[PDB]
Amino acid sequence: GLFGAIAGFIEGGWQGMVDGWYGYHHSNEQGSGYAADKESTQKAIDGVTNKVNSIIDKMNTQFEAVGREFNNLERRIENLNKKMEDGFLDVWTYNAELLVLMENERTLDFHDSNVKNLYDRVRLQLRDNAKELGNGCFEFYHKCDNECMESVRNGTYDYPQYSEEA
Amino acid sequence: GLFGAIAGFIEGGWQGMVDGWYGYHHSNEQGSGYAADKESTQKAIDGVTNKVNSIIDKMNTQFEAVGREFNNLERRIENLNKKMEDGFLDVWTYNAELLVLMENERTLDFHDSNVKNLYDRVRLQLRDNAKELGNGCFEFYHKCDNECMESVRNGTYDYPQYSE
Amino acid sequence: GLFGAIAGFIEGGWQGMVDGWYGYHHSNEQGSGYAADKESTQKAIDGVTNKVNSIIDKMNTQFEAVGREFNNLERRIENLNKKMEDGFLDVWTYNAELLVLMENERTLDFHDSNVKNLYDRVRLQLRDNAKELGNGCFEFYHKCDNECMESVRNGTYDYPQYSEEARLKR
Amino acid sequence: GDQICIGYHANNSTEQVDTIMEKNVTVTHAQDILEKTHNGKLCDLDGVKPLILRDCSVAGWLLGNPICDEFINVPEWSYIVEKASPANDLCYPGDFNDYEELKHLLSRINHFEKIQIIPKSSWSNHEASSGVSSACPYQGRPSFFRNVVWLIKKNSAYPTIKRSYNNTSQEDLLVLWGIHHPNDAAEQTKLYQNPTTYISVGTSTLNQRLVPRIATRSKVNGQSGRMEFFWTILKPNDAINFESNGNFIAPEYAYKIVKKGDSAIMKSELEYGNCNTKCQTPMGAINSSMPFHNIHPLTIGECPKYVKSSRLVLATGLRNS
Amino acid sequence: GDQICIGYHANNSTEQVDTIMEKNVTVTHAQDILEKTHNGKLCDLDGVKPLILRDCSVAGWLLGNPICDEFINVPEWSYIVEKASPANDLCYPGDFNDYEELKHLLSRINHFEKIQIIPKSSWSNHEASSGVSSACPYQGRPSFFRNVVWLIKKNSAYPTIKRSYNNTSQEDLLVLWGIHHPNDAAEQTKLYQNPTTYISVGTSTLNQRLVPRIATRSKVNGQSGRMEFFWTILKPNDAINFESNGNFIAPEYAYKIVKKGDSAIMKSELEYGNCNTKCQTPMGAINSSMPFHNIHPLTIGECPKYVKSSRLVLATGLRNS
Amino acid sequence: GDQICIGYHANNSTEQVDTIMEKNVTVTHAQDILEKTHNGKLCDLDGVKPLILRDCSVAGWLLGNPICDEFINVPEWSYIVEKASPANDLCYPGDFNDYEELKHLLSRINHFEKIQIIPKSSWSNHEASSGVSSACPYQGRPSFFRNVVWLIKKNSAYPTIKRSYNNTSQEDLLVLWGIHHPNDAAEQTKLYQNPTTYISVGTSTLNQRLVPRIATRSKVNGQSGRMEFFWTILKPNDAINFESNGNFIAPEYAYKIVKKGDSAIMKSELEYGNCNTKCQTPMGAINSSMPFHNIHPLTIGECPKYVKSSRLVLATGLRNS
């Protein structure tokens, strides 16, 4: 997209993660499955929610048309009233549509960025103790089981705990 | 630059490349030359063309001024009328100018981005099979030919066949 | 952050760097200290300054209310006048508020990008003469005295001077 | 043997959104923000029913056009509904002075109480029940606007009229009266006796003197004469004084302004739908959670904000593979 | 060792754009979207010639100011052009009632067919050919507006006029007439005989009685008197009725509105340029594929959107080195 | 091992800004751009003092209501301050024709010079010193508007008046006059003798004939009579001609327009505060370099731009810790 992560180096989405928005798939000794990161999926829900609520609140003061009537010798003023009400309606319609166009693009590039930073926060939480497959995947130069996963999926994974495996 | 690619770690643009906006330069056994990434030099023109068309289309609903006449005992409304028109012209003059200013920024940051991601879709492939020279180039831990290139350009470069 | 650097892989900021927006904390044989990055801080100060002036210049063409008066037989146009002035006022208040909202977000991401870019210019200069700790720090393989440190800050770190020495620590 | 992946949600979603650079982008989650439907009927607005004028115009209602009687007694309303071109306006042709200012006033009024400021039975020296016309039938019989009275001479005399009414109430009073412009000087003599007539009307602010214009005009509803109507707001403790020697269409009923507030005069063809709503448009009522709608700009109530779009969809989720 | 690099395009381009943070950013490719030029002439619009009034005003054309004879009969037009301050307005000074509203109607009219509703030859008991003035010269001799007739007493008698015209056609008919306000009572009797006079005009909707105002005023084009002109739109199947015993400036010609449509009254000093265009401004026509322009905000035709900018450039390519 | 770290600034700042996705982001450096304070006074504008009307209206001032003689002689001003509801308007009740149009003209006027065009002394065949009323007290005694003259019959006669005044100056002249509408035919005779009266006023462009209307009205300031005032701009070298045979309120003084420029009629309840400013609002003056303010929308001078916001803060620094 803009951050190279969604539909980029990571080629596709996991039709099998009902868990959440961004996640992990682990394939190891004691079984293989999916797990969504609850940390940065919630953080992304808060951001999208406020963005929705702030867009609505911004259109709170938008123009409200009011009916006015004129006789047939007040044609100039009848015409001025019409052009100006339609004027404000076009202005606020442009504002709603454009703001939606712009924030949609940003909302996408946002998700794109969240996936990327998650990859990057794990990638340097591994250094050389693992190998970058390049398609969004890491292979371990060592042994790793479930209790080894809660460790990476939470933020702290010991670097000199497997540094010697080579 | 926002993504640090153009005017960044790649210090400048090649006058030499004319196939497209982004691309490659290789110096293998057989001479050297410039190659343009067609598949994403196109997605660029698709994006920019869409943006140019979307800007114009958002504008087609603009206010149109219409002349009105008033006599000299209708000064208040003549004035109201003039202010109303000037008023909408300034609102739309603003909208047009600011949209151009914001999108120009985004457009620049979009190229910047496509260049970084091309350097990444590449580096994600080769890895240890090449060296990160630094200036935006790659020194090979092996040798390449004019048919190894189509595979790095293609994005179907077989990594394990070249470990040695 | 949008670029992962501020509040991200660089966990927090430094209260010790009074010198600028972005910079360096070195540590070596002579000892340790802070120092700003004069060029990135400058480039950014200018972009922020310009943004502020552009936003303001963009508003000087905005709507100015004028007082108008109507008698009791002119309620309809008295009401049209009021709704028209309120309407322009709301349109420009919306513009000012939204433009500031949108640009505050960009400015914040602008700093984020600047920090990431700073870190990466260093990363690319050092290459493998140094270890990437993961928190915005590099552990050198060679010896880096105060002269060698001003060099990576000035963006003139000479890799070939330390190639040989660094190769051996590996 | 041991590996872990980082990836993103994907699913079976059809919902598309647009951006500046790409239209029709499939996304995993979206949020429609545009209400595009209504219930096609005219409704109570929060419990209070609209005054639906049907085929009467506002003037037909206020003056009492004898086809418009259905509105002799009206309860407090939430908005007024008038057709774009009502068939019953002025049975007897003429004009209504400053009509559109009056309509504008009405838009901020929710209730009137009729007061009988000058009873028809009160006219000793003028004929008060012979001013009727086939232009204004009531139940097969020639009749006239019911809230005002078309005085005619009595025993070949039309003595000068002097009448006052003081608004001793604490509310404003809407007062209507009229002048008749005859077709020729014979009809003038026939009706009012006096050849040269006037109507004067005074309030603390009003200073009016009207003179009939006698001319030959096109027949409208069979009539070559014209009736011209005037009005004023009579403030608390002010009085209104009429004086005339002919051509006077006198008030019988005035309207006390008993309740003001948010209201409207809605232009709509629709009829009463027997339902409730918190938001009404001339094309039907709206019931939605949505922040925007594209039904009609001219609404009343707590409504979503009107926009001219046909589609408004916000991206919430991410790009769907 | 071997090598592959990734870089970006560069060129000799000078083209500059702006962003919020940076002005004058040289890019490789850029799309200018603002039309800044015109042709400086007044052209046809889609092959239809505009009515160009030259030095006449709309009133001088419609009333038939004798100096304005170029416009006695006029072909279908696409727009009307009038100077900021036309030399020929009313030769005989006075006023034109509801002029600006009439000009407003014109903005939606593309053609008139003139029709002779009361031929000058049919006034048998009034002088119809002696109402002329030095204020309105034709070929250096006293003359008058051509579409309208200044009637005068005949044998020291001005019998009461009664005329009516019925618009039998299926189009609206614009009718014009006037009243003469003399400068003193002597002039009043010299021209009309009767000291106290009026003009009554009725249409199904018009109910008018005008009285002359005899007063002393500054000379304008030599005259202390004044003419005041009036108009109405006579709908299909309505009649108009005139009655008067003096001061009547009668219609002879009226205008049937035979072609409605989009039109405009442009104020411009320019003359016909013998060319064609899709887009006309008061400063000159525009040939352009650009979406914006900054020539003038009052255009007519298929035009780009007006914007006040002096420069509007879109970035397409990338930042140049 | 030798280390170098990349990082960013942090500090003690508590300043917050908003974004679309997040509110109250604590920021390293912000910039308020919204002025929210004023000095609560009315000041000189660029050194020039305002004309402060105090308890008088513009009408009370130009006509010369005896309770407002403070403004008999006024110097050049920068703007005019009027109260929303001046206690002193028209001492003798009635109306001021096209009053708002005149007020509009004043906002482009900085100085008048009052000049005497028809001396009160020069009325030899009419009583010029008896048109007084207890509605217009001066020093507790019956008086009248100072700038016009209520002429009355003399020796049981009101000869027809014919005065004329020619503007020989280089400046436009504002001329004012009025008519008296009495409350019955008896008063008409006591005051003016002639039962049927008029006032004709002519300028090269004005063609006016006023007739007094008799009606029964409520007492305002103890008066059932009403005065109605009229005005016009007399061009250089044009003449105004008056003719009347009763009910005429003649000009005595008129106002020469000596300085045109930017000006305004500002509605404020404040009084003068002996200070200077380059930006004045109805609620107080502003001294600010801010690009925006939210004090009031109706300002005069060189002001920040008005917005409705309570808070406007631009982020300059970065997210704090």
Ligand SMILES: *[C@@H]1O[C@H](CO)[C@@H](O[C@@H]2O[C@H](CO)[C@@H](O)[C@H](O)[C@H]2NC(C)=O)[C@H](O)[C@H]1NC(C)=O
């Ligand atoms: C309307 O009728 C009322 C009731 O008599 C009049 O009100 C009195 O007016 C006198 C002075 O005119 C005041 O001092 C009293 O206080 C009023 N009485 C009340 C109860 O308010 C009023 O004047 C009449 N209106 C007219 C125009 O004659």
Ligand SMILES: *[C@@H]1O[C@H](CO)[C@@H](O[C@@H]2O[C@H](CO)[C@@H](O)[C@H](O)[C@H]2NC(C)=O)[C@H](O)[C@H]1NC(C)=O
């Ligand atoms: C103008 O003349 C037309 C045509 O004679 C009149 O319309 C006829 O009017 C009668 C009733 O008055 C209708 O029943 C006919 O159908 C009409 N004929 C046509 C052909 O439409 C019209 O009324 C006249 N207008 C005036 C003011 O007298």
Ligand SMILES: *[C@@H]1O[C@H](CO)[C@@H](O[C@@H]2O[C@H](CO)[C@@H](O)[C@H](O)[C@H]2NC(C)=O)[C@H](O)[C@H]1NC(C)=O
């Ligand atoms: C008002 O007075 C001026 C000045 O006396 C009159 O103008 C002179 O007018 C005559 C023509 O009538 C010329 O010969 C002079 O050159 C004029 N001089 C100026 C100063 O313009 C003017 O005519 C008078 N206005 C009226 C309506 O009588």
Ligand SMILES: *[C@@H]1O[C@H](CO)[C@@H](O)[C@H](O)[C@H]1NC(C)=O
């Ligand atoms: C967008 O999709 C809609 C229907 O889903 C269609 O009307 C339109 O043609 C599409 N636009 C493009 C760019 O294909």
Ligand SMILES: *[C@@H]1O[C@H](CO)[C@@H](O)[C@H](O)[C@H]1NC(C)=O
């Ligand atoms: C931008 O360049 C133009 C001329 O190419 C010049 O008018 C203007 O001063 C420049 N802007 C700045 C910021 O120097």
Ligand SMILES: *[C@@H]1O[C@H](CO)[C@@H](O)[C@H](O)[C@H]1NC(C)=O
């Ligand atoms: C922003 O801070 C203000 C001041 O304390 C507080 O009242 C408001 O609720 C805050 N907004 C949010 C979303 O926390």
